[PDB]
Amino acid sequence: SVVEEHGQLSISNGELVNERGEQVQLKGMSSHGLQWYGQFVNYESMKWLRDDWGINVFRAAMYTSSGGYIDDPSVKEKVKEAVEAAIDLDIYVIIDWHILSDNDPNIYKEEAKDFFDEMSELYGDYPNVIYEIANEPNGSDVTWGNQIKPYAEEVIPIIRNNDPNNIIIVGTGTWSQDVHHAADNQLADPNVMYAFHFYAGTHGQNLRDQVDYALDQGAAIFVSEWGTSAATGDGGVFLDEAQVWIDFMDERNLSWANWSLTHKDESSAALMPGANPTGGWTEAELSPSGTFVREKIRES
């Protein structure tokens, strides 16, 4: 239903729009690392998210380091499973090259080019796919102008040779918070968005003003990862601040994916220890974070 109705997404005047030019907002869940919690990524759990939570996007978080793709590339097959389920369920899917400890996206750029060539060759003629080429560039030595933008300018051509206009989300500096610098020196591709990530444990009023500054430069922003916890993914659940961000994203037509779909014992995890990896969760099998996120998507 979702993908049949909205079809080809594109960027028009800095807004995500459907194929009829109408604004569309995607709301869904991100997996945790596929090398650790890949059992929660399957057709049945994604269908349950679609039908019971109302998701219209799913994000496959393929870490590169931390025992991820570079050490064991077999995790790429779990990304393929998620994309295939999204196609079968008629929802959108984000393929996330999930850099983090490997803080400069240039570290594994050759592997990234080969991976995105493969994924775009396979899925480049489906409208469901959104490519997220560098989760969270970070470090004082990794800047938009010197490291991130040039990396994007090598990887985007690889994707575009196979898929000329599906959306590409490009990470920003300081763990995808520095949308101000990216917005002042935007990429040329017309179907790019910049990632903005937040955690509700951080007081967010200036970060909201910074997202607004970027939107004011005509940059499109996709909140491809956010949590109800502190920045570590743990340390408490901050639902008052999360609601302020939810309302902010609705007013600005910002699409988002919540972190994350796992039973890991940390506050940002959506599930409790006994949650079935194939879905069907009762109220008690959702954590306080999962209950809130589910409510937000159901309300939408």
Side-chain angles (χ1 to χ4, degrees):
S1 45
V2 174
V3 176
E4 188 177 43
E5 182 185 340
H6 293 296
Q8 197 65 41
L9 305 181
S10 65
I11 302 299
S12 180
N13 295 136
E15 297 294 344
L16 183 67
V17 295
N18 67 15
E19 67 187 17
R20 290 167 201 272
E22 319 191 325
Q23 287 185 5
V24 63
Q25 194 175 17
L26 304 183
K27 300 178 182 174
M29 285 302 295
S30 184
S31 70
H32 196 292
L34 301 176
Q35 72 278 28
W36 298 314
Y37 300 109
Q39 72 270 29
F40 291 98
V41 179
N42 57 76
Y43 175 90
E44 288 298 316
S45 69
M46 285 170 68
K47 186 178 186 195
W48 179 255
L49 286 169
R50 182 195 70 180
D51 290 347
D52 178 73
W53 294 35
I55 76 165
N56 60 12
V57 63
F58 190 81
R59 177 172 183 254
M62 189 190 73
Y63 278 68
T64 45
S65 191
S66 300
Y69 180 77
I70 296 301
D71 296 319
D72 178 356
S74 76
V75 66
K76 75 177 183 184
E77 295 302 323
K78 183 60 65 184
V79 173
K80 300 180 189 175
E81 182 179 350
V83 172
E84 290 171 19
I87 290 163
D88 289 337
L89 293 167
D90 216 43
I91 64 171
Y92 294 96
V93 60
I94 298 166
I95 297 172
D96 161 28
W97 180 259
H98 198 94
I99 77 171
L100 187 63
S101 65
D102 52 320
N103 63 294
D104 183 341
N106 292 288
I107 294 160
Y108 299 118
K109 78 170 187 194
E110 293 302 327
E111 296 88 345
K113 293 170 75 179
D114 288 344
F115 173 80
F116 282 113
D117 189 19
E118 183 182 357
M119 299 295 116
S120 63
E121 191 136 346
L122 283 168
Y123 304 119
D125 210 9
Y126 291 93
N128 308 66
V129 182
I130 297 163
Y131 305 92
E132 177 171 10
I133 62 169
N135 170 50
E136 281 184 358
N138 61 96
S140 282
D141 42 357
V142 179
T143 64
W144 179 252
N146 296 333
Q147 279 73 42
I148 308 164
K149 193 183 191 192
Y151 165 84
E153 287 169 334
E154 296 197 25
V155 176
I156 295 173
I158 300 304
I159 293 167
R160 291 298 179 231
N161 204 45
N162 295 329
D163 183 341
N165 46 211
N166 272 338
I167 301 295
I168 297 171
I169 295 168
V170 183
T172 58
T174 317
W175 291 276
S176 288
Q177 299 177 95
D178 189 1
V179 288
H180 188 123
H181 281 115
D184 283 347
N185 185 14
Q186 291 174 49
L187 285 156
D189 190 274
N191 289 305
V192 156
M193 308 180 81
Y194 307 93
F196 177 73
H197 293 182
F198 71 83
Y199 281 100
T202 297
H203 293 195
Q205 188 164 338
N206 196 237
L207 292 155
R208 280 183 290 279
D209 286 342
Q210 290 301 322
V211 171
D212 283 340
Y213 172 88
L215 298 169
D216 289 349
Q217 313 317 302
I221 296 299
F222 195 118
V223 180
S224 66
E225 190 179 296
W226 69 274
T228 53
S229 64
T232 55
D234 205 4
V237 181
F238 299 82
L239 300 192
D240 291 336
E241 185 68 9
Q243 186 68 56
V244 173
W245 275 107
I246 287 288
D247 294 342
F248 172 87
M249 290 189 290
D250 278 354
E251 296 232 301
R252 285 64 181 168
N253 186 47
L254 300 179
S255 288
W256 56 252
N258 174 257
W259 185 267
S260 71
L261 193 76
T262 182
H263 62 198
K264 189 170 173 72
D265 185 21
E266 64 189 6
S267 306
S268 58
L271 308 177
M272 295 307 278
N276 190 309
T278 66
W281 314 306
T282 62
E283 316 90 284
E285 295 175 285
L286 300 188
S287 67
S289 181
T291 286
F292 173 83
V293 177
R294 172 175 178 283
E295 295 212 5
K296 302 302 97 183
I297 307 187
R298 284 172 64 80
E299 279 166 359
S300 198

